[PDB]
């Protein structure tokens, strides 16, 4: 079967139902490429999606929205689906909402291209992350400070290994609060962080007389006389004896009969050749070779080193700290949701394995209009 058609407005939605990555722009900045076929071993004869396919760096692809999404009297809703068909070792398959600007040379989709929000799955080695970041404009320095969003309560792993297509929803209400419904289940929610507070005088110094040492050695207890601290942990076994067929003259190891410093070697500093030692064979059929070593047994009188007991330090003036002195770059927490608008949705992804499946890219402001395209697309 198949169907999924827009309900209300658009902002951006793409189902690749047409069948082509018609309408997407490979970067040119500076690799891997993309295609739009069915799912590997599908189960839906018709739903093909934009799919990564390499190991190089799909650092590319993006597309212009249908209309600049501004952050005012409508919340933001973005949602797509991915599915690491070959499971991800270490890579990312999150979306990037390219900010608005006069001429947005997409084709030049650089890496430090300004975006407004980043969002989606990423997991390297064994971290399993589902991001959501929204760069805030330092309303003073004017610096673009990317404010993250705490992890979710729920392990994610499964979503990256069950080689089965999952869905990601992102909703940011002007409230300045959110949640990250993934496969319908809101796995995360909320409402560094934009405004600040103070700072400490980096010109303050932990004085030397300031003791931050909880416990200390009881200056009373003293190393006992029997505690000979110079006694080794090992002393020879005078009970032992040197086997008889032992070869005192036969040299432990011998220089290998392949001793040839490659005519590619530069003693001048490729080091200073030395023929690897082999292993004098004469010894193979012998008790031992070269200088004998009377085996060591443990040592009865070994002790260690004076272990004076620890005791609280009557003067441990708690761990010292800089004397908090005012906030110059002190800014403010407006209605954050009023972040710079974006005009494109792109994907600069590192990755590792191929066959990553992307699809149903949809971006609307209404929740229903989005909840439908969902049960329409993914729901199928
Ligand atoms: Ca599709």
Say if residue 163 is in the same domain as residue 295.
no
Say if residue 353 is in the same domain as residue 218.
no
Query: What span, in angstroms and rounded, lies between the C-alpha atoms of 176 and 318?
Result: 39
CATH code for the domain in which residue 299 is found: 2.10.250.10
Going 99 to 341 to 140 to 333, the CA torsion angle's sign is: negative
Place of tokens 């200390």: 216
- Tally: H helices and E strands in the chain: 2, 19
Give phi and psi for 156, each to the nearest 5.
-105, -40
Say if residue 63 is in the same domain as residue 149.
yes
| Three state DSSP letters for 135-169 | EEECCCCCCEEEECCCCCCCCCCHHHHCCCCEEEE
CATH code for the domain in which residue 48 is found: 2.60.120.200
CB 181 within 8 A of CB 197: no
Residue 122 marked ligand-binding = yes
Say if residue 62 is in the same domain as residue 196.
no
Given 304, 321, 337, which residue is the final one in a domain? 337
Say if residue 51 is in the same domain as residue 2.
yes
CB 380 within 8 A of CB 45: no
Residue 140 marked ligand-binding = no
Token representation of residue 157: 């792993």
Token representation of residue 251: 């040299």
Upper half-sphere CA count for residue 190 (Cβ side, 13 Å): 15
Give distance in angstroms: CA of 47 to centre of ligand 1: 5
Question: What range defines the domain where residue 358 resides?
Answer: 1-191+338-378
Query: What span, in angstroms and rounded, lies between the C-alpha atoms of 107 and 113?
Result: 11
Residue 359 marked ligand-binding = yes
Say if residue 55 is in the same domain as residue 95.
yes
Give distance in angstroms: CA of 18 to centre of ligand 1: 9
Query: Of 161, 140, 13, 138, nearest to 87 (Cα)?
Result: 161
Domain count, the chain: 2
Give distance in angstroms: CA of 203 to centre of ligand 1: 59
Query: What span, in angstroms and rounded, lies between the C-alpha atoms of 379 and 370?
Result: 12
Give distance in angstroms: CA of 17 to centre of ligand 1: 6
Experimental method: X-ray
Q: Which helix (H) or strand (E) holds 172?
A: strand 166-173
Residue 171 to residues 79, 155, 186, 253, 377, Cα–Cα distance (Å):
9, 20, 10, 71, 18
Give distance in angstroms: CA of 27 to centre of ligand 1: 22
Say if residue 114 is in the same domain as residue 104.
yes
Residue 115 marked ligand-binding = yes
Which own/partner pairs from 204-213 qualify as long-range (CB within 8 Å, at least 24 positions apart)? 204/322, 204/323, 204/325, 206/320, 207/320, 210/317, 210/320, 211/313, 211/315, 211/316, 211/317, 212/316, 212/317, 212/318, 212/319, 212/320, 213/313, 213/316
Say if residue 315 is in the same domain as residue 347.
no
Residue 282 marked ligand-binding = no
Give distance in angstroms: CA of 230 to centre of ligand 1: 76
Give phi and psi for 136, each to the nearest 5.
-105, 140
Say if residue 27 is in the same domain as residue 151.
yes
Given 322, 337, 352, which residue is the final one in a domain? 337
Query: Of 78, 158, 92, 162, nearest to 121 (Cα)?
Result: 92
Pairing of strands 76-82, 166-173: antiparallel
Say if residue 273 is in the same domain as residue 210.
yes
Residue 330 to residues 148, 198, 202, 327, 333, Cα–Cα distance (Å):
19, 7, 17, 5, 10
Give distance in angstroms: CA of 81 to centre of ligand 1: 9
Say if residue 26 is in the same domain as residue 110.
yes
Query: What span, in angstroms and rounded, lies between the C-alpha atoms of 23 and 43?
Result: 26
Residue 253 marked ligand-binding = no
Give distance in angstroms: CA of 103 to centre of ligand 1: 29
Upper half-sphere CA count for residue 372 (Cβ side, 13 Å): 14
Give distance in angstroms: CA of 117 to centre of ligand 1: 23
Say if residue 50 is in the same domain as residue 120.
yes
Q: Quick one: 30 exposed, middle or buried, by C-beta within 10 A (0-12, 13-18, 19+)?
A: exposed
Give distance in angstroms: CA of 79 to centre of ligand 1: 13
Give distance in angstroms: CA of 183 to centre of ligand 1: 16
Resolution in A: 2.9
């Amino acid at each position: 079967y198949k169907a999924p058609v827009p309900s209300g407005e658009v902002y951006f939605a793409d189902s690749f139902d047409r069948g082509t990555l018609s309408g997407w722009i490979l970067s040119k900045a500076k690799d891997g490429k993309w295609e739009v076929d069915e799912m590997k071993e599908t189960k839906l004869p018709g739903d093909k999606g934009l799919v990564l396919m390499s190991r190089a760096k799909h650092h590319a692809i993006s597309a212009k929205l249908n209309k600049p999404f501004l952050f005012d009297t409508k919340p933001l809703i973005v949602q797509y689906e991915v599915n690491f068909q070959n499971g991800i070792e270490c890579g990312g398959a999150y979306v990037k909402l390219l900010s608005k600007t006069p001429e947005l040379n997409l084709d030049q989709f650089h890496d430090k291209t300004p975006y407004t929000i980043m969002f989606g799955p990423d997991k390297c080695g064994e971290d399993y992350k589902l991001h959501f970041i929204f760069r805030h404009k330092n309303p003073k320095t004017g610096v673009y400070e990317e404010k993250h969003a705490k992890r979710p309560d729920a392990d994610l792993k499964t979503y990256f290994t069950d080689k089965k297509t999952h869905l990601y929803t992102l909703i940011l209400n002007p409230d300045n609060s959110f949640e990250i419904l993934v496969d319908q289940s809101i796995v995360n929610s909320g409402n560094p962080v934009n405004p600040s507070r103070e700072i400490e005088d980096p010109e303050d110094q932990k004085p030397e007389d300031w003791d931050e040492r909880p416990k200390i050695p009881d200056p009373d207890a003293v190393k006992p006389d029997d505690w000979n601290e110079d006694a080794p942990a090992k002393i020879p076994d005078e009970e032992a004896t040197k086997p008889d067929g032992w070869l005192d003259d036969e040299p432990e190891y011998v220089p290998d009969p392949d001793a040839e410093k490659p005519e590619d070697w530069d003693e001048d500093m490729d080091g200073e050749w030395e023929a690897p030692q082999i292993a004098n064979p004469k010894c193979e059929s012998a008790p031992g070779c070269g200088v004998w070593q009377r085996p060591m047994i443990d040592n009865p009188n070994y002790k260690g080193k004076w272990k004076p007991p620890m005791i609280d330090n009557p003067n441990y003036q708690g761990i010292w700290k800089p004397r908090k002195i005012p906030n110059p770059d002190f800014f403010e927490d407006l209605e954050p949701f009023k972040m710079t608008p974006f005009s494109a949705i792109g994907l600069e992804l590192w990755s590792m394995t191929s066959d990553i499946f992307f699809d149903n890219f949809i971006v609307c402001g209404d929740r229903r209009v989005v909840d439908d395209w969902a049960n329409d697309g993914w729901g199928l």
